[PDB]
Design a protein around this ligand. Sequence first.
Ligand SMILES: [Cl-]
Ligand SMILES: [Cl-]
Ligand SMILES: [Cl-]
Ligand SMILES: [Cl-]
Lengths: 246, 246, 246, 246
Amino acid sequence: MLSNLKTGNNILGLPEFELNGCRFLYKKGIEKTIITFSAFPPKDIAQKYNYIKDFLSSNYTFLAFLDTKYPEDDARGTYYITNELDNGYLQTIHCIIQLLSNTNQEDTYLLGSSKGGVGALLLGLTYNYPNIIINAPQAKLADYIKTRSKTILSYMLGTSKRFQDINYDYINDFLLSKIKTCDSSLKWNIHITCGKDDSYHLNELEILKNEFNIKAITIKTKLISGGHDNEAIAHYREYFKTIIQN
Amino acid sequence: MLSNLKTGNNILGLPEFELNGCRFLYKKGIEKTIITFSAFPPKDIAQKYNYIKDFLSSNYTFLAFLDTKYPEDDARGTYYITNELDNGYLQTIHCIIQLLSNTNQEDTYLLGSSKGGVGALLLGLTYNYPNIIINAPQAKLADYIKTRSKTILSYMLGTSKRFQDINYDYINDFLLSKIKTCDSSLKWNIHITCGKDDSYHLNELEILKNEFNIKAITIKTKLISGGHDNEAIAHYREYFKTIIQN
Amino acid sequence: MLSNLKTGNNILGLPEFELNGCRFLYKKGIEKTIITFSAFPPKDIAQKYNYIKDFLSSNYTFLAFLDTKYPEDDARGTYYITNELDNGYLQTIHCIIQLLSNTNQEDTYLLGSSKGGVGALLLGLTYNYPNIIINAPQAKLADYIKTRSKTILSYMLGTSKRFQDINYDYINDFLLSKIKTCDSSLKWNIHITCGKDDSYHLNELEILKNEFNIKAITIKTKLISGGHDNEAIAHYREYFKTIIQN
Amino acid sequence: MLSNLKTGNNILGLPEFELNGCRFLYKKGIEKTIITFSAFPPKDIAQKYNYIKDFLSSNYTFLAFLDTKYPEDDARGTYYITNELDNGYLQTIHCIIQLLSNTNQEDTYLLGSSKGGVGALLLGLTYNYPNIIINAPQAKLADYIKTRSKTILSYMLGTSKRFQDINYDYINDFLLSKIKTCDSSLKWNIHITCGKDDSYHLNELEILKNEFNIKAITIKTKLISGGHDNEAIAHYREYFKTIIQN
Ligand SMILES: [Cl-]
Ligand SMILES: [Cl-]
Ligand SMILES: [Cl-]
Ligand SMILES: [Cl-]
């Protein structure tokens, strides 16, 4: 029962739930369903739910998800991938949305920036959520984790020295594989913004663009002001409300 | 959205849903949640939901589950174990129950006979459902599947000659392993009936009892009229109605 | 080199060869290629090549094959199935035909009676040899091996008590599976005679007929005089020469 | 029929054939049979036949082989091992050579470098080809495949998490196992060159030499100019022309 999944935490008035290690906020509304994904916080700062305030007065249905809770000594998430390096966590998220949401797929919108934007792509490409509006995702996931936490990278590569390189390449390509194996017949509605000064992630977008191109899937991109920073996020927020409100 | 998970089928007035390959009936009720698992049908017979008629006038919340849909050429289920021999299917069942149920865990009851009883144990021991009331479950799963479908066993064993023995043992001990790793401190309320002329499953019950014994779990057992047959099932139905109504 | 594969045996003037445990006779001719398969000899009698005399004065290309050489204490063959219970032996036979024969598939004819007829079906259904003209094959291969040699059956089921039943069913169905998985688009030219007094194999033919029927493949059958005996073989020989000469 | 196995391709005037997934060039000659195996090409480059130009004016019998055609998304071969990690592909190569060659075994020469040299050893040690003259083969096969294609290694490891380690060791030791089980009494004539600056494969050669040593097999070795590169290959070509012409 939903009320028995509560953790005792409360974010801006919304009670937190947890199911199968997956923490989420939920507010039931009407007309549309809004889904958001957490990005990396600073070291020793708790993972944060995204874009609550944007939809506090919206009265749409709202779900916000965090990343995984391991490794315990730097618990900032493993890019929505299980410690078995499989889809178990995304499967849990999909079940929560499908059973708690009161709109259909075409009226559901997936949001997130950076790691949060990768999480939106991972879920939406696996389970055919067509509306994905994100900012500055990575393409090569292991390369980026390496720059943010050596502790998380070494946890995900595992203790066997022989499979560390193998696991690194598998993680690096986990998002690119989802594009390679997604359903080309769906009427995808994918939007990807990126700061014009975000030279690293501008190149990452070119990698994603190429993978969609050889799949004959058309996406929308938009250059916004800023780097990989709060200035870009401020414009990305402005961008997704105008797309959603129209 | 739950209403969009409808398959189109109806069973004795209840609509059928499907989520992540998991087919189920659901009717919202009050006071108690009743969960049932399907057993093996005869060859070329469709998988059936169990004990619907027992709870139509009860107005309890009622959820009934089928086994997996593969192998396609004998689609009678893989003992609620994924083709990867892992917990992915049980995980989906757990999500469905936790979000759709409107009662506490201690007011939830898991029912099933033979393979259905094994499914009830696998879920209950993995995710801490204390009330498990079942009839004549197996202990050695691969030994029994062997007698019902060579096709299904071969599918679960896989195609590699070198891994036949290893996977036979892994499947055979899958439920015993769940007992060995369950939480000894939960207030388990496990009831297992078995027909007095069901010699095979009387011996399976002793194998199960020994695993519970060494985990400091005492269960209740009762011999009823019949073999491994409809007579025993008739008396098992009378039994769980009594326990639930007291 | 072909001449270096000789064994030293010589059958009616034809030197015997062996490649990868596969013994064969070969005579190069023109126009058509004739392939024959050995059936079970009596206990302690050597495996025999079939229908040499029929094509001694024919001047067609001719290949005659024996079954496998194991088990050593009753080496009458394992139905052209390896002791790994796979296609390794048929693969060797196919290579020999493809490299030594000087006609194409449509001008090649596969012949055999009883176990020899099963061998023709096994090879022709795996590798798309359309012309298969045989007498009184079995459908349930393990049931029949049991009646001819307990030593061969126990060798093929293997020493592990747990996999004996599993292997028995797999062998029993090895031919039926080839029909289930063969290419329905080929212009099959399959002829199956059977003695009118051969009540056991008349029923086996009904089993094969049904499996071809659900595959939408049409075959030809013909009742001949005799049981499962030399009278039937004499008429079967008369039958295949008239089909081949026209 | 051999002429019906033509693929349509021609390489420097020689027609390409295919039998049971095994692609090969064949030109009938006299006096000696020369066999070559293909090494790994660079990524996105087609597999190439080796050392054609070396034997065009020689009028020897010449057979050149490619590796397997899978995995389709990096089709550079699986080290002449089947997707079942067994001898089925080597068995096809053996049949082709034994039936098409017009010379004795002791007048047959197996050639190849790096992965091609491993293929020459796998065939020669399995089926008693005494003349093996190769350059810089690997000893630990999975360790090296790891550095050339994660895609190919993952395909050979399979999909089961529980069998990753087991299959890594099985592939890694596949050639060492052939040495351990080969016939010590054959009059082996094995020559292995290696560039003097190819430190990695100098160490691999010592691992191989130790397995031969304990089987009482003495081999000839020679250091040549170069690393693991075209310089070494140029000097290896000069080397095998010398040995074959004396
Ligand atoms: Cl991030
Ligand atoms: Cl059952
Ligand atoms: Cl026979
Ligand atoms: Cl190579």
